[PDB]
């Protein structure tokens, strides 16, 4: 019921990274940002997003061996929504004030306040590390920021222009696509979910990629 | 140089869970909360903390296959500090405003604002035994229930039950370790042995509030439930 698109890949089949800002339909509503397992899409992104705007999510707070989780169940209207992951578990790691607002074992329908789509390239002798230093400018604050991305590990015997974008996926992720040395290839750096759902939209629109420096570090 | 102790375990050898609130010593200082790999201690906790108050940490921002990390190197004064993990890597996951403050590949000494110590115990499926730990936020007067998975049990002639009985007391405490963790100890288990369950609450929190949460989140009680799978 409110969207934002980050288009890193424009292609016939592409990986879809979906993240949603939710709010519980109950008397102690918790606000949550969760993301879907990745899936493949063959329809235009602007068109997938519209269909995703009909998303209906149901969560249920549960315990698991690897900490507490949320058993998610989702639905949407549209042909392209047949491939949408319907039932998946997520780590119920929330802002500490939200823990009180998380009723255990109560199947609650959540209400989508924003739906984010990120397009990606479908997935399908040893020293020095090739690392890419992605340079950005926070236009809200006019303060630079450099996020390092590990690329390859090369061996040493005794790129010019690439694109980087801040996208909302595992909270926020930086995705960098290299054009040639190979070919179109993406590196994802996870920045973590520790952030206000409101600021997620803010960061993406204010963090402008300035340039990329490739460095080499002996191991 | 400030300290706080959470004594879940009191024993001859015990697991030490150390977490520190740091601030870089540079011209764009980043504030950081990192925790040490767990280690064993044989000296009193109040005594280990004193020695830990002499902690000197050096971080260096680096890239890794599993996102960006911080190459940590640490030292402290005192005999018990021989066992302290000296060189360890940590995930460099910070509050977003902090990313600008983190300088790539610049070896910076960090300054310890607070040292936290937490003591611990050294270490065909139908239903799940889950413990609902009940707490009260005294600052806000609002309850909070954190569910801990204990074990999977098998019931012959089984249904899909709820609340359970032994086979009544246990203690639970909110402690600063992987940011904040709830640690629950089963006194007279099935009523094996004294056994602890750690629930990770995540590092998503202001270093200041970490001290606040621990002092205000009081354990009210524990309900044992059963959930069919
Ligand atoms: Ca609720
Ligand atoms: Ca700095």
DSSP string, A168-186: -SSSSEEEEEE-----SEE
- Calculate the alpha carbon distances from B43 to A124, B46, B114, B161 in Å: 54, 9, 21, 45
Q: Measured in angstroms, how far is the CA atom of residue B101 from the centroid of ligand 2? A: 4
With a CB cutoff of 8 Å and minimum separation 6, the contacts of A182 are none
Q: A212 with A164: CB under 8 angstroms?
A: yes
Nearest to B13 by CA among B171, B173, B121: B121
Chain B residues with at least one Cβ partner in A under 8 Å: 61-65, 67-68, 93-96, 99-100, 104-105, 128, 130, 132, 137, 140, 142-149, 180, 199-205, 209, 213, 225, 227
The maximal CA–CA distance of chain A, rounded, in angstroms, is 68
Tokens of A24: 């519980």
Q: What is the DSSP letter of A48?
A: H
Closest CA–CA distance from residue A79 to any residue of chain B (Å): 32
Q: Considering only CB atoms, which chain A residues are within 8 Å of B61? A: 148
Q: B24 with B33: CB under 8 angstroms?
A: no
With a CB cutoff of 8 Å and minimum separation 6, the contacts of B208 are none
Our measurement of the distance from residue B204's CA atom to the centroid of its chain's CA atoms, rounded to an integer in Å, reads 13
In chain B, beta strands by DSSP E: 2-7, 14-24, 31-35, 39-41, 56-62, 69-75, 87-91, 108-120, 127-137, 142-153, 171-175, 181-186, 195-200, 217-228
What is the spatial distance between Cα B125 and Cα A91, in angstroms, rounded to a whole number? Answer: 23
Q: A216 with A128: CB under 8 angstroms?
A: yes
With a CB cutoff of 8 Å and minimum separation 6, the contacts of A192 are A170, A171, A172, B93, B94, B204
H-type alpha helices, A7-153: 45-52
Q: What is the DSSP letter of B209?
A: H
| DSSP H/E element including A17 | strand A14-24
Q: B144 with B206: CB under 8 angstroms?
A: no
CA angle B17, B21, B23 (to 5 degrees): 145
Q: B175 with B182: CB under 8 angstroms?
A: yes
Tokens of A80: 């392209």
What is the spatial distance between Cα A216 and Cα A113, in angstroms, rounded to a whole number? Answer: 43
Q: What is the resolution of this structure in A?
A: 2.8
Tokens of A172: 């926020």
Q: Measured in angstroms, how far is the CA atom of residue B103 from the centroid of ligand 2? A: 5
Determination approach: X-ray
Closest CA–CA distance from residue B131 to any residue of chain A (Å): 9
| DSSP H/E element including A153 | strand A143-153
Nearest to B33 by CA among B113, B100, B96: B113
What is the spatial distance between Cα A218 and Cα A129, in angstroms, rounded to a whole number? Answer: 6
* β-strands B195-200, B181-186 pairing: antiparallel
Residue with tokens 């610049």: B106
With a CB cutoff of 8 Å and minimum separation 6, the contacts of B19 are B33, B34, B35, B36, B115, B116, B118, B176, B177, B179
CB-nearest to B137 from A65, A100, A191 is: A100
The values of phi and psi at residue B160, to 5°, are -170, 70
Nearest to A166 by CA among A128, A135, A194: A135
Contact B100 A143 (CB under 8 A): yes
H-type alpha helices, A34-193: 45-52
Q: What is the DSSP letter of B170?
A: -
Chain A residues with at least one Cβ partner in B under 8 Å: 61-65, 67-68, 93-96, 99-100, 102, 104-105, 129, 131, 133, 138, 141, 143-150, 172, 189-195, 199, 203, 215, 217
Nearest to B197 by CA among B215, B170, B216, B217: B170
Q: A62 with B147: CB under 8 angstroms?
A: yes
Task: Determine whether B229 is exposed, middle or buried from the number of CB atoms within 10 Å of its CB (0-12, 13-18, 19+).
Answer: exposed
What is the spatial distance between Cα A170 and Cα A192, in angstroms, rounded to a whole number? Answer: 6
Residue of B nearest to A175 (CA): B67
What is the spatial distance between Cα A16 and Cα A167, in angstroms, rounded to a whole number? Answer: 12
CB-nearest to B200 from A67, A144, A149 is: A67
What is the spatial distance between Cα A48 and Cα B20, in angstroms, rounded to a whole number? Answer: 45
Q: Measured in angstroms, how far is the CA atom of residue A66 from the centroid of ligand 1? A: 22
* β-strands B127-137, B217-228 pairing: antiparallel
Closest CA–CA distance from residue A105 to any residue of chain B (Å): 10
Nearest to B18 by CA among B35, B33, B32: B35
Tokens of A39: 């899936």
Q: B123 with B9: CB under 8 angstroms?
A: no
Tokens of B4: 């706080």
Tokens of A46: 């602007």
CB-nearest to A68 from B99, B142, B147 is: B147
What is the spatial distance between Cα B108 and Cα A187, in angstroms, rounded to a whole number? Answer: 27
What is the spatial distance between Cα A132 and Cα A129, in angstroms, rounded to a whole number? Answer: 10
Q: A124 with A200: CB under 8 angstroms?
A: no
Task: Determine whether B138 is exposed, middle or buried from the number of CB atoms within 10 Å of its CB (0-12, 13-18, 19+).
Answer: exposed
What is the spatial distance between Cα B32 and Cα B27, in angstroms, rounded to a whole number? Answer: 15
Tokens of B29: 């200082």
With a CB cutoff of 8 Å and minimum separation 6, the contacts of B132 are A104, B145, B146, B147, B148, B222, B223, B224, B225
Q: Measured in angstroms, how far is the CA atom of residue A113 from the centroid of ligand 1? A: 16
Nearest listed ligand to the Cα of residue A100:
1
With a CB cutoff of 8 Å and minimum separation 6, the contacts of A179 are A159, A161, A162, A163
Task: Determine whether B194 is exposed, middle or buried from the number of CB atoms within 10 Å of its CB (0-12, 13-18, 19+).
Answer: middle
What is the spatial distance between Cα B214 and Cα B197, in angstroms, rounded to a whole number? Answer: 17
Nearest listed ligand to the Cα of residue B22:
2
What is the spatial distance between Cα B29 and Cα A212, in angstroms, rounded to a whole number? Answer: 24
What is the spatial distance between Cα A54 and Cα A86, in angstroms, rounded to a whole number? Answer: 14
What is the spatial distance between Cα A165 and Cα A209, in angstroms, rounded to a whole number? Answer: 7
What is the spatial distance between Cα B213 and Cα B175, in angstroms, rounded to a whole number? Answer: 9
| DSSP H/E element including A14 | strand A14-24
Q: Under CATH, which number does the domain A1-121 receive? A: 2.70.20.30
What is the spatial distance between Cα A152 and Cα A154, in angstroms, rounded to a whole number? Answer: 6
Residue with tokens 């108050």: B53
CB-nearest to B204 from A62, A68, A93 is: A93
- Calculate the alpha carbon distances from B62 to A31, A193, B37 in Å: 33, 20, 19
Tokens of B111: 């300054």
Nearest to A193 by CA among A211, A168, A213, A163: A168
Closest CA–CA distance from residue B93 to any residue of chain A (Å): 6
Q: A121 with A14: CB under 8 angstroms?
A: yes
């Amino acid at each position: 019921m409110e969207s934002y698109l980050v288009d890193t890949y424009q292609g016939i089949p592409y990986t879809a990274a979906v993240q949603v800002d939710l709010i519980e339909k109950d008397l102690l509503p918790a606000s949550l940002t969760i993301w879907f397992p990745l899936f493949q899409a063959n329809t235009p992104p602007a068109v997938l997003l519209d269909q995703l705007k009909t998303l209906t999510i149901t969560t249920l707070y549960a315990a698991s061996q690897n900490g507490p989780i949320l058993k998610v169940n989702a639905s949407a209207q549209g042909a392209a929504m047949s491939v949408l992951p319907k039932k998946f578990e997520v780590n119920a790691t929330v802002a500490l004030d939200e823990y009180s607002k998380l009723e255990f074992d109560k199947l609650t329908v959540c209400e989508v306040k924003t739906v984010y789509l990120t397009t990606m390239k479908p997935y399908g002798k040893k020293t020095h590390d090739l690392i890419a230093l992605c340079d950005f400018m926070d236009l809200e604050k006019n303060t630079p920021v450099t996020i390092p991305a590990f690329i390859k590990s090369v061996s040493i015997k005794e790129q010019a222009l690439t694109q980087a974008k801040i996208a909302p996926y595992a909270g926020l992720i930086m995705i960098m696509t290299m054009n040639n040395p190979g070919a179109g290839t993406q590196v994802i750096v996870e920045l973590g979910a520790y952030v206000q759902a409101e600021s997620i939209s803010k960061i993406c629109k204010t963090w402008s990629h300035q340039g990329t420096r490739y460095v080499l570090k002996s191991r």
